[PDB]
Amino acid sequence: PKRELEQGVAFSDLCNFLVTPTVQGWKVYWAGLEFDVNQKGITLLNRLKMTRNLFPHLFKNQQSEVQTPIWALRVILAAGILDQLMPLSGALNLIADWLLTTSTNHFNMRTQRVKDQLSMRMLSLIRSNIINFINKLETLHVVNYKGLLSSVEIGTPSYAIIITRTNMGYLVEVQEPDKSAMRHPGPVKFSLLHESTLK
């Protein structure tokens, strides 16, 4: 049955965040997209917590917590979905949430409605959103003294995402919707994804 095949492939590709260890780090395969995530930049972030004074809310703040590079990738995927989002966006939003607020490799479709939504079209729309987003990110300039764009922000009721281009990769942060971390020393989660990962 055509619907059956279609939904079989969409379910498989959207509900399984596939991670495979490699020599340099990790291969991630999700939604038919492939990423090489390496462990570079990892140690540097621990060590920091000039740049240190630029992002005091991350480095000079006992409420900031460094995450894994895979977490950073997942934040980038969710952001990619949400950025155009701002049809059934219910399913999209669920997916983005799963990606960003959890570390599980499988997406439990709770409702049957959600399951019904999983289709070639949904796969297609998600892939296109994420690719568009990645292209946008690649247009960011490194942090600079002229007025050239270096950050994008994706704000939602539940959380605020901020992604910044620096000489060491994309700095990926999630703060509370209000931006309590920016006083004040509100909580914030963050990491670094090397440039190579998005190419």
State the SS3 of the chain. Answer: CHHHHHHHHHHHHHCECEEEECCCEEEEEECCEEEEEECCCHHHHHHHCCHHHHCHHHHCCCCEEECCHHHHHHHHHHHHHHHHHCCCHHHHHHHHHHHHHCCCCECCCCCHHHHHHCCHHHHHHHHHHHHHHHHHHHCCCCCCCCCCCCEEEEECCCCEEEEEEECCEEEEEEECCCCCCCCCCCCEEEEEECHHHHC
Which residues contact residue 123 at a Cβ distance below 8 angstroms, ignoring those fewer than 6 apart? 9, 10, 13, 14, 31, 32
Contact 90, 114 (CB under 8 A): yes
Domain that holds residue 53: 1-199
Looking up tokens 């922000």 gives: 153
129/131 Cα distance (integer angstroms):
6
17/30 Cα distance (integer angstroms):
5
Experimental technique: X-ray
Which residues contact residue 188 at a Cβ distance below 8 angstroms, ignoring those fewer than 6 apart? 57, 58, 61, 63, 64, 65, 173, 174, 175, 176, 181
Resolution of the structure, angstroms: 2.1
Domain count, the chain: 1
Long-range contacts (CB closer than 8 Å, 24 or more residues apart) made by 60-63 = 61/181, 61/185, 61/188, 62/185, 63/181, 63/185, 63/186, 63/187, 63/188
End-to-end CA gap in the chain = 37
Both tokens assigned to 72: 């950073």
129/57 Cα distance (integer angstroms):
30
